[PDB]
């Protein structure tokens, strides 16, 4: 159920936090040796959030504060 008439805008802080999270996901030293068990961010080497793709998020009062690509991922301060 894609609800209409309920959309929020992305400030600069959320974008730089997502960029930092992607940089942490990509160049990890402790990763899995195979290139098939990793997630979609680490396998296909995503660098920025594109036009349309499904992202988990959390907002308050029409402004979003954080966005994560999977269910249980890491949080940046």
Partner RNA sequence: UUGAUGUCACGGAACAGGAACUUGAACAACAUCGUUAC
**Binding region for RNA (CB under 7 A):** 25, 28, 30-31, 39, 41, 70-74
Is the Cβ of residue 33 or residue 61 nearer to RNA in the bound state? Answer: 33
Is the Cβ of residue 5 or residue 30 nearer to RNA in the bound state? Answer: 30
Q: How far is the CB of 28 from RNA (least distance, A)?
A: 5
The sign one gets for the Cα dihedral 41, 47, 50, 55 is positive
Is the Cβ of residue 28 or residue 45 nearer to RNA in the bound state? Answer: 28
**C-alpha 6 chain-centroid distance:** 20
């Amino acid at each position: 159920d894609l609800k209409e008439n309920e959309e929020y805008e992305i400030p600069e802080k959320a974008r730089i936090k997502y960029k930092e999270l992607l940089r942490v996901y990509n160049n990890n030293p402790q990763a899995v040796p195979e290139s098939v068990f990793q997630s979609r961010v680490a396998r296909e080497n995503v660098e920025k959030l594109k036009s349309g793709d499904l992202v988990y998020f959390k907002h308050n009062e029409k402004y979003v504060e954080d966005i994560v690509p999977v269910r249980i991922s890491r949080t940046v301060d």
